[PDB]
Design a protein around this ligand. Structure first.
Ligand SMILES: CC(=O)SCCNC(=O)CCNC(=O)[C@H](O)C(C)(C)COP(=O)(O)OP(=O)(O)OC[C@H]1O[C@@H](n2cnc3c(N)ncnc32)[C@H](O)[C@@H]1OP(=O)(O)O
Ligand SMILES: CC(=O)SCCNC(=O)CCNC(=O)[C@H](O)C(C)(C)COP(=O)(O)OP(=O)(O)OC[C@H]1O[C@@H](n2cnc3c(N)ncnc32)[C@H](O)[C@@H]1OP(=O)(O)O
Ligand SMILES: *[C@@H]1O[C@H](CO)[C@@H](O[C@@H]2O[C@H](CO)[C@@H](O)[C@H](O)[C@H]2NC(C)=O)[C@H](O)[C@H]1NC(C)=O
Ligand SMILES: *[C@@H]1O[C@H](CO)[C@@H](O[C@@H]2O[C@H](CO)[C@@H](O)[C@H](O)[C@H]2NC(C)=O)[C@H](O)[C@H]1NC(C)=O
Ligand SMILES: *[C@@H]1O[C@H](CO)[C@@H](O[C@@H]2O[C@H](CO)[C@@H](O)[C@H](O)[C@H]2NC(C)=O)[C@H](O)[C@H]1NC(C)=O
Ligand SMILES: *[C@@H]1O[C@H](CO)[C@@H](O[C@@H]2O[C@H](CO)[C@@H](O)[C@H](O)[C@H]2NC(C)=O)[C@H](O)[C@H]1NC(C)=O
Ligand SMILES: CC(C)CCC[C@@H](C)[C@H]1CC[C@H]2[C@@H]3CC=C4C[C@@H](O)CC[C@]4(C)[C@H]3CC[C@]12C
Ligand SMILES: CC(C)CCC[C@@H](C)[C@H]1CC[C@H]2[C@@H]3CC=C4C[C@@H](O)CC[C@]4(C)[C@H]3CC[C@]12C
Ligand SMILES: CCCCCCCCCCCCCCCC
Ligand SMILES: CCCCCCCCCCCCCCCC
Ligand SMILES: *[C@@H]1O[C@H](CO)[C@@H](O)[C@H](O)[C@H]1NC(C)=O
Ligand SMILES: *[C@@H]1O[C@H](CO)[C@@H](O)[C@H](O)[C@H]1NC(C)=O
Ligand SMILES: CCCCCCCCCCCCCC
Ligand SMILES: CCCCCCCCCCCCCC
Ligand SMILES: CCCCCCCCCCCCCC
Ligand SMILES: CCCCCCCCCCCCCC
Ligand SMILES: CCCCCCCCCCCCCC
Ligand SMILES: CCCCCCCCCCCCCC
Ligand SMILES: CCCCCCCCCCCCCC
Ligand SMILES: CCCCCCCCCCCCCC
Ligand SMILES: CCCCCCCCCCCCCC
Ligand SMILES: CCCCCCCCCCCCCC
Ligand SMILES: CCCCCCCCCCCCCC
Ligand SMILES: CCCCCCCCCCCCCC
Ligand SMILES: CCCCCCCCCCCCCC
Ligand SMILES: CCCCCCCCCCCCCC
Ligand SMILES: CCCCCCCCCCCC
Ligand SMILES: CCCCCCCCCCCC
Ligand SMILES: CCCCCCCCCCCC
Ligand SMILES: CCCCCCCCCCCC
Ligand SMILES: CCCCCCCC
Ligand SMILES: CCCCCCCC
Ligand SMILES: CCCCCCCC
Ligand SMILES: CCCCCCCC
Ligand SMILES: CCCCCCCC
Ligand SMILES: CCCCCCCC
Ligand SMILES: CCCCCCCC
Ligand SMILES: CCCCCCCC
Lengths: 527, 527
């Protein structure tokens, strides 16, 4: 068969004599989208000889089919059915009123079975090791958190088994792929406060620290532009094809702003219902709220020519195809104005579901404000850790309170839905609700990890802190050596979820092993 | 115009009325080759209207043109002329006896001018720096030698300005590209003796040293197979497309054999016309001469099916096209027998001049014998350095003697010619004369470098010893990051020697700077 991954075969038999049919397909997860032509089914030449057409339908989400008379342009019937991968289905259209009935010729496969088995195998190894062991300065929980984010990042970037829930969301919502980048920004803010407090307490000058901050930011941005962004398999670099934004550029700009702000308003940590960690940094909070107001004003009030004001949508076929070139609204307009199309990301995640043609950069200029807000919430987590380190109860109470406040803000902004909130969660736009949701997740993760790993010591963070102590080396390495063996080899079946998943799991485990080897040899690179 | 790099335009005007012409081209540097059809020139339809044909001729070497009547298959005239790059030439064939006259319409460019200017600029910088400075354990000469080889290797591997004399020779002879690999084998043998003598004098066990040797050899071979050989821009690795031989595999096998031999017959260095450094290692010499006899016997006496015995030729169109699939003779036959075609090098250097279709691996199985002989001559250089270190005169006398003996052997074997000796110099075959020639070069280089750098100290080896102390890092790095900026960018003219040369010089200078930075930070990787 010619079915690709996540496709099903749909045979359409038209038993109507005097009506040609057009089949329109729509995904249930494509919001306010247009129907697209699936296949044209000619009329039956004679009674008893139904004309037949075959099409491939995507099986990742539910499908909506609309059969339309191609001359009268009126609807004969409609189906909403969830096809299964590699299934063989038939749709018969017959008189007596026109009734279309769907039949299953060959049953589909269970496409999520490899993930179910992989989790069971991983759980079995965990229990066996934990049971077997029973018979026989630096905060470890932050390293554990950063290493969990790194392991998820390596699994997702290498393919995620080609599963849609291990890829980035098209426009709105969350998948597993969308969680780790905000967590990196959060952890980097926490590390900003921890490192700077230690350095300034030891007696270092503020200008020497300023030079160190500037050097680190410059070097992060340069590595992102020159080493990570370009696809050098396509050919030598030309300026007109150079993408300026990116992941490390975002981290460098965010690090510079937040670190300089902390340095400029730095205070010694003093020596319990108190708000000292909040009120001692009120200039920081005022500047952060002004930046957030700037993001909201630009997102909702800046007029974009040939586009609605306050547009939060993917363009393409979405929003009923009314704004095909409006992917991003103000964010995309500001990117295209200051940098130009050719210096932006050319493969936005909305292209596959909404068929967008314009270039949109997820790490663009406008979302750096919300990136800074995420890093500053991480700074607050570090402030809690250092202000109340003598009291575990105080730290846990404050982590719980921040998690609850940010979760309530997320509930209010999103209305607990993918597309219907005032500000729906969106990684491409780096929305405010995106930041509050992932920040409440991060505060809860720390609420669990701090007492287990740092205070009680029931768990040492293995094997997560090994890459967490070599994050920049792991990141740049997995970018440089993505196509190399043993991370990537040729598969016997490229349309198999099982083979892709096995390959991606093996490559992630290899990066964990590399980080462990570097830890044992005491080789640590800090950018 | 549609002239590529190193092409000239040749317009052929046939003023003959009753003879069609076929133009055959042959390079003067293609040995015993066949003529190939250049262009067909129809007869002149009427007197005063000569038929015209245009062709492109390569300008790297001299050309031989033969104009043949396509019906009578007899020669009308013949030219041997050296065309210039981007020149515009005309060849007029007319009656009165048929005389063909060559005329120059547009003069060619001086293609070697960028190299002439680059050397003058480099010399000017050297004199300016040396003049300016006048106003204001580890052997350094071996590091200087290894760093010179590394700088040449990086320049050549990145393109060499696309100049033919900075590329590998097609089959026989030497260019600048063909010098550095034997020098690496020689230096590695010298380092084998120096390192092993120090380790065994310090009191280490021979089995611990054996384990270290085995680990280093295994790791070199693995890096060569997995990291250097594959082109991962083409796609994920499949076993049937994996090249087994290579540069680091050759170094690993040679290192294992020579290091184990030295370890097994190791003797303490004792404390002047004496031959102690030669007679104390007579078992090594006997085994090396037996291996050399094996190479000669296999090269000249092994019958290769469908091929002459003792064949030292490229196949293809060479040797008058008689043996088109005999590229390599016994060496290629042994490679194709033990490994198969698909695991060999698919782009041998003979393909462009001799049009060979079979795969030949320059780092194949049979030439490992001569690789071992080269490394053992390096071991002898190290023996001279350590046995007579108290006397500079003894070291210089012995370096001179070895250089002269190996040079005389090279003269006898090659008869001072490219193709007419008993064993002509050939890097693809790793010939005996190749090894003796490059070994005499290496002994002369050491004869010059040792007193200047190590004894008198007139020169410190700058800037050559910086990469010489990080050779494996420089090699693997320039292989991994070849396509990256700033080593490679898009050129305004891809048919320009000047732009290619400037790019390659800049990339080589960048690798020297990287090695200097690693030296200043005391970061040294020893495989
Ligand atoms: S792709 C989408 C996801 N993006 C990525 O994966 C991008 C990759 N980014 C990263 O790995 C990181 O965000 C980095 C490397 C850019 C920055 O990591 P950070 O969290 O800022 O910390 P990093 O390890 O670099 O060290 C920063 C400082 O914090 C300190 N620090 C880090 N972790 C801890 C900890 N757990 N406890 C105490 N101090 C810590 C370090 O000592 C260092 O201080 P120093 O300069 O005085 O020695
Ligand atoms: S592409 C065609 C060209 N091919 C290449 O460029 C391949 C690249 N190959 C290379 O760079 C080298 O041949 C290598 C890295 C494989 C081996 O380099 P070597 O010459 O064997 O020496 P290397 O620097 O690795 O060190 C080997 C030993 O010799 C010693 N050594 C090296 N140079 C010197 C010196 N000048 N003086 C004293 N000892 C030295 C080292 O200390 C080391 O001993 P140790 O293990 O006790 O510390
Ligand atoms: C299929 O035909 C139906 C007709 O029932 C179309 O639905 C109508 O579309 C028009 C737009 O031209 C609307 O004004 C109507 O409100 C729709 N409903 C009805 C009941 O008329 C439908 O658009 C057609 N499908 C496609 C893809 O064009
Ligand atoms: C899907 O199932 C149908 C059966 O409903 C298959 O149709 C058969 O096709 C073969 C050859 O193509 C014919 O010999 C049979 O007569 C068909 N049966 C019917 C009932 O039509 C169809 O081939 C299947 N599609 C696949 C396997 O891709
Ligand atoms: C061009 O024609 C000449 C004829 O002068 C060919 O040279 C002869 O080639 C035959 C082979 O068929 C030899 O036996 C003769 O000895 C050659 N010389 C003479 C004087 O006859 C030449 O081979 C032709 N060129 C090509 C490319 O075929
Ligand atoms: C090489 O030089 C000849 C001159 O000998 C060029 O021929 C001229 O071509 C132009 C247009 O193609 C004609 O208008 C002239 O009449 C031609 N002159 C002669 C004397 O034939 C030829 O174009 C040149 N080839 C190039 C520049 O590629
Ligand atoms: C400091 C915080 C709270 C506020 C910062 C945002 C303010 C200063 C700015 C940012 C973008 C601005 C908007 C940008 C453009 C327009 C369109 C124009 O036709 C009317 C004004 C209006 C609608 C502006 C109103 C003020 C605005 C919202
Ligand atoms: C130890 C050194 C000096 C000599 C080693 C080489 C000897 C042992 C071997 C290596 C390859 C061998 C040759 C390989 C194959 C043939 C073809 C056969 O029809 C006759 C013997 C002959 C011609 C062999 C003669 C001996 C030979 C030359
Ligand atoms: C997100 C799914 C990917 C699963 C990755 C599994 C990694 C397991 C670690 C393997 C290597 C451990 C080495 C450290 C031993 C102390
Ligand atoms: C084979 C031609 C290539 C020319 C390479 C020139 C390299 C010159 C060195 C430049 C960097 C020097 C850094 C060390 C300073 C002490
Ligand atoms: C169906 O389409 C064909 C053209 O392919 C057309 O000739 C025919 O008339 C159409 N059917 C009806 C009922 O009009
Ligand atoms: C030249 O070739 C043509 C075919 O292209 C042929 O017709 C003609 O006869 C040939 N010239 C002579 C003199 O035979
Ligand atoms: C390390 C190896 C990881 C393999 C995990 C399991 C892959 C999925 C198997 C599913 C079989 C139906
Ligand atoms: C030890 C001297 C302290 C004096 C004030 C230092 C201020 C540092 C922050 C300056 C911010 C400048 C933005 C680029
Ligand atoms: C006394 C030691 C001073 C060390 C360097 C301090 C100056 C660096 C300032 C960088 C500012 C960059 C702003 C874009
Ligand atoms: C002492 C070293 C100073 C290095 C300065 C480098 C330039 C500063 C660039 C960082 C700013 C990036 C975000 C605006
Ligand atoms: C020295 C005490 C001054 C207190 C000023 C008020 C601080 C208010 C902080 C606002 C924080 C808003 C986000 C939680
Ligand atoms: C696709 C919809 C996403 C909405 C996410 C918001 C959930 C609210 C979080 C509540 C607090 C959780 C604490 C860990
Ligand atoms: C996110 C998953 C948390 C648990 C992972 C457990 C891995 C193995 C733990 C056993 C080692 C315990 C060391 C103290
Ligand atoms: C470092 C820059 C190296 C440039 C060397 C000169 C290139 C050739 C110039 C020739 C001009 C005709
Ligand atoms: C200290 C013990 C010395 C005993 C002899 C050591 C011999 C080492 C070389 C062995 C060669 C084996 C080839 C793989
Ligand atoms: C006493 C310490 C011993 C250290 C290891 C020695 C044994 C290694 C032998 C490797 C031989 C490989 C031959 C292919
Ligand atoms: C103590 C570490 C031993 C490692 C042994 C690795 C296997 C030996 C392979 C080297 C041989 C390569 C040329 C035959
Ligand atoms: C202990 C003295 C024994 C001497 C034996 C003869 C040694 C001959 C060495 C041959 C070397 C050939 C290549 C130069
Ligand atoms: C293309 C022909 C190459 C022949 C090379 C042989 C030259 C002989 C070397 C003489 C000794 C030189 C000492 C440096
Ligand atoms: C192969 C070329 C040899 C000479 C190169 C000279 C480079 C610069 C030398 C000046 C520095 C002297 C340090 C003692
Ligand atoms: C700050 C880093 C900027 C890197 C610019 C790269 C330019 C490469 C294109 C040059 C060849 C056309
Ligand atoms: C069919 C190819 C299987 C490749 C297995 C992956 C390699 C994992 C171990 C790598 C050790 C270097
Ligand atoms: C010693 C190193 C051998 C490496 C073998 C690589 C095999 C890769 C092909 C597997 C996928 C078809
Ligand atoms: C037209 C593009 C010119 C690129 C110049 C090469 C860069 C050399 C310096 C690199 C510093 C990182
Ligand atoms: C997704 C869990 C994978 C379990 C195997 C990890 C160890 C190689
Ligand atoms: C402690 C100084 C406060 C400066 C005003 C706050 C907003 C920048
Ligand atoms: C001096 C107290 C001012 C408080 C400002 C608070 C800004 C959020
Ligand atoms: C870094 C600025 C480059 C932007 C070039 C195009 C501007 C529209
Ligand atoms: C071939 C000599 C090049 C001279 C320039 C080297 C310094 C960048
Ligand atoms: C000192 C032992 C000599 C062994 C014979 C030489 C050839 C292997
Ligand atoms: C015991 C002396 C034998 C000499 C052998 C020489 C081998 C080249
Ligand atoms: C390493 C041996 C592989 C060779 C496979 C083909 C043999 C003809």
């Amino acid at each position: 068969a010619e079915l690709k991954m996540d496709q099903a075969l749909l045979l359409i038999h038209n038993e109507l004599l005097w009506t040609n049919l057009t089949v329109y397909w729509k995904s249930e997860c494509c919001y306010h989208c247009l129907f697209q032509v699936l296949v044209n089914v000619p009329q039956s030449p004679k009674a008893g000889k139904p004309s037949a057409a075959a099409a491939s339908v995507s099986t990742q989400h539910g499908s909506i089919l609309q059969l339309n008379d191609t001359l009268e342009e009126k609807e004969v019937c409609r189906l909403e059915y969830r096809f299964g991968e590699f299934g063989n289905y038939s749709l018969l259209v017959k008189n007596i009123e026109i009734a279309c009935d769907l039949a299953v010729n060959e049953d589909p496969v269970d496409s999520n079975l490899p993930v179910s088995i992989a989790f069971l195998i991983g759980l079995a190894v965990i229990i066996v090791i934990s049971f077997l062991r029973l018979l026989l300065p630096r905060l470890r929980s932050v390293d554990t958190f950063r290493g969990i984010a790194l392991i998820l990042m390596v699994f997702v970037n290498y393919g995620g088994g080609k599963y849609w829930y291990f890829k980035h969301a098209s426009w709105n919502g969350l998948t597993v792929a969308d969680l780790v980048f905000p967590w990196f920004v959060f952890i980097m803010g926490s590390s900003i406060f921890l490192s700077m407090t230690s350095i300034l307490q030891r007696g270092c000058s503020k200008f020497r620290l300023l030079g160190k901050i500037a050097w680190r930011s410059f070097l992060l941005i340069c590595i992102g532009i020159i080493i990570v962004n370009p696809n050098y398999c396509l050919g030598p670099l030309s300026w007109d094809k150079v993408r300026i934004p990116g992941v490390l550029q975002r981290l460098g700009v965010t690090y510079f702003v937040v670190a300089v702000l902390e340095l400029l308003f730095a205070k010694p940590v003093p020596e319990c219902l108190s708000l000292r960690d909040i009120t001692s940094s009120w200039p920081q909070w005022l500047l952060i709220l002004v930046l957030e107001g700037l993001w909201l004003g630009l997102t909702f009030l800046l007029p974009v020519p040939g586009c609605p004001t306050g547009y939060l949508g993917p363009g393409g076929i979405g929003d009923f195809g009314k704004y095909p070139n409006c992917t991003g609204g103000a964010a995309g307009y500001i990117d295209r104005l200051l940098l130009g199309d050719d210096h932006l990301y050319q493969h936005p995640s909305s292209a596959v579901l909404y068929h967008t043609e314009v270039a949109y950069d997820p790490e663009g200029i406008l979302g750096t404000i919300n990136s800074i807000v995420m890093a500053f919430l991480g700074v607050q987590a570090g402030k809690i850790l250092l202000y109340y380190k003598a009291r575990t109860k105080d730290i846990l109470i404050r982590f719980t309170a921040w998690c609850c406040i940010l979760g309530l803000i997320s509930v209010a902004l999103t209305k607990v839905s993918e597309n219907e909130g005032f500000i729906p969660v969106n990684k491409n736009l780096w929305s405010l609700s995106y930041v509050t949701t992932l920040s409440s997740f991060a505060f809860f993760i720390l609420l669990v990890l701090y007492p287990v790993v740092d205070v009680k010591g029931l768990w040492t963070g293995t094997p997560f802190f090994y890459p967490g102590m070599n994050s920049i080396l792991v990141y740049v390495g997995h970018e440089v050596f993505e196509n190399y063996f043993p991370f990537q080899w040729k598969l016997k079946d490229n349309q198999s979820h099982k083979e892709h998943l096995t390959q991606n799991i093996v490559a992630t485990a290899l990066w964990v092993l590399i980080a462990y080897i570097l830890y044992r040899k005491k080789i640590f690179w800090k950018i």
